[PDB]
Enzyme design. Structure first.
Site, PDB file in Angstrom:
ATOM      1  N   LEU A 106      94.209 -47.459 117.980  1.00 15.15           N
ATOM      2  CA  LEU A 106      94.485 -46.388 117.034  1.00 15.15           C
ATOM      3  C   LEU A 106      95.978 -46.212 116.800  1.00 15.15           C
ATOM      4  O   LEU A 106      96.397 -45.932 115.671  1.00 15.15           O
ATOM      5  N   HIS A 107      96.790 -46.375 117.849  1.00 13.05           N
ATOM      6  CA  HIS A 107      98.237 -46.284 117.685  1.00 13.05           C
ATOM      7  C   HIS A 107      98.792 -47.481 116.927  1.00 13.05           C
ATOM      8  O   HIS A 107      99.811 -47.358 116.238  1.00 13.05           O
ATOM      9  N   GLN A 108      98.142 -48.640 117.039  1.00 13.24           N
ATOM     10  CA  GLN A 108      98.521 -49.814 116.265  1.00 13.24           C
ATOM     11  C   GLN A 108      97.669 -50.009 115.021  1.00 13.24           C
ATOM     12  O   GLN A 108      98.074 -50.756 114.124  1.00 13.24           O
TER      13      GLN A 108
END
Length: 189
Positions: free
Chosen positions: A30-32
């Site tokens: 999700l962060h990437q």
RNA sequence: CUAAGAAAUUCACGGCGGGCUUGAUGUCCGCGUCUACCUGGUUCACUGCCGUAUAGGCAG
């Protein structure tokens, strides 16, 4: 009150890891997948959150636009988890959605880092820097954390995130870097 | 409401002189340890970042 496109993510069990490690690796996805993807009006919702159990979630409930969720289903970067977890399809949202709060907020429960910068800036001593910082300035936040044991410290760590209150009225806003609330609410059902 | 109820042991001191313990010796023979395993405890409710005031782009 207008974003009625959801993208759910159901979590199945696997023998090589528990749901906490899958929540950490999916947190990296999700962060990437959002920070390295693009789209401010795309948030996520954790429906199995419990502040009395320290859990993170038993089923992901994504919230995006029509094309914001219609172009992320065919993600080849979303592969791998297709063998580990399960997916769904797009579905409409109801009219009255309760305004909930889910976002990221970092707390400072350690005076040793500010004692390092305070030793490099204030010039504190052992007893003067150790006594200038009281013992009550540190506190552990017992929110739902994620063991994001990446390549900064080798041991397992915790996760920090602050949620908001519950409400009924709609107050939309721009999502954060991880698809959370930072001044705009999100529906919770 | 108890074989109940009560109570000053004190003062002082030189243990010390001498001695040959010796002589001799075989510890020996023999032996199957073996099958099976996910350490990811948190080898610290965490380790370094704009404010010595709880606000964060962190390697997470």
């Amino acid at each position: 009150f207008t974003m009625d496109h959801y993208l759910d993510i159901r979590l199945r069990p696997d023998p090589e890891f528990p749901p906490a490690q899958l929540m950490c690796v999916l947190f990296g996805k999700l962060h990437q997948a959002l920070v390295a993807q693009g789209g401010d009006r795309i948030g996520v919702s954790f429906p199995d959150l419990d502040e009395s159990r320290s859990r993170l979630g038993e089923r992901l409930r994504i919230h995006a636009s029509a094309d914001d969720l219609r172009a992320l289903l065919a993600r080849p970067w979303l592969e791998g988890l297709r063998d580990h977890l399960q997916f769904g399809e797009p579905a409409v949202v109801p009219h009255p959605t309760p305004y909930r709060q889910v976002s990221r907020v970092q707390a400072k429960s350690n005076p040793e880092r500010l004692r390092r910068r305070l030793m490099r800036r204030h010039d504190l001593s052992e007893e003067e820097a150790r006594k200038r910082i009281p013992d009550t300035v540190a506190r552990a936040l017992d929110l739902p954390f994620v063991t994001l044991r990446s390549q900064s410290t080798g041991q397992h760590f915790r996760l920090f995130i602050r949620h908001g209150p519950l409400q009924v009225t709609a107050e939309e806003g721009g999502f954060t870097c991880y698809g959370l609330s930072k001044g705009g609410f999100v529906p919770w059902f």
